[model samples]
Target: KTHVQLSLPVLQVRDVLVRGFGDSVEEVLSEARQHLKDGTCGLVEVEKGVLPQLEQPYVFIKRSDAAPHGHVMVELVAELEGIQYGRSGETLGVLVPHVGEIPVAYRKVLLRK
Candidate 1:
């Protein structure tokens, strides 16, 4: 049996906005306080340094007949407002007692260069 894990990192630190359930934020901060906790949430915080880099390094090679590649590039953007938190002080991104973190994605875009 092969176990494969996939991570979707489309959310940027600056773009991630939290709201509602004031106290819950603290819980998540606590739970994910340092590196080495019961779960891996905290671990992630310590392991990750600054926000991951966003790059779309691709240029059209101008095929035999392909619309004459002009400006082509791929871009991903996430913009959302009013994110709700929980009561336990755990951030909406954190687990919910039994339920796991409420992972979310705002938006994504791809352009051609």
Candidate 2:
């Protein structure tokens, strides 16, 4: 399981950051659960090179206005340190699977204390 922080730009429940853990939809739902009573947020598959000019494929967990200009601007933040390793040992490196990714790659590479 991975811990993540999604910075949503639209309002559903309140002006708050969504947080959750998991590898797929479990993660998406955790954050969206907050909006179930207030509004809606979409799990969009975004292409690279849109506004915010994202350089990699990412899931846009946000509202309809998340990409008002055709570009997905929802921010997805992850905690690599929370990434669990196998019995082999501590991870020196990892080959991440990109849906169709760079900012997350760059951010994950540098570990912080």
- The TM-scores of all predictions, comma-separated, are 0.17, 0.19
Report the lDDT tens digits of candidate 1 across residue range 1-113. Answer: 12112122223333333311124434433432221123222101111532232111111111121111331222111111333322121111221111233434411111221
lDDT of each: 0.22, 0.26
Model 1 stretches with alpha carbons more than 4 Å out: 1-23, 34-39, 42-113
Question: For candidate 2, what is the TM-score?
Answer: 0.19
What range of 10 consecutive residues in model 1 has the weakest lDDT sum?
A: 54-63
Candidate 2 clash figure, as a count: 0
lDDT measured at residue 25 in model 1 versus the true structure, 0 to 100? 37
For model 2, the stretches where C-alpha displacement exceeds 4 angstroms are 1-25, 40-45, 50-113
Write model 2 residue lDDT over 10-76, tens digit each, in one string.
Answer: 2211121222223554353344344322323322233342213221212223221213223332233
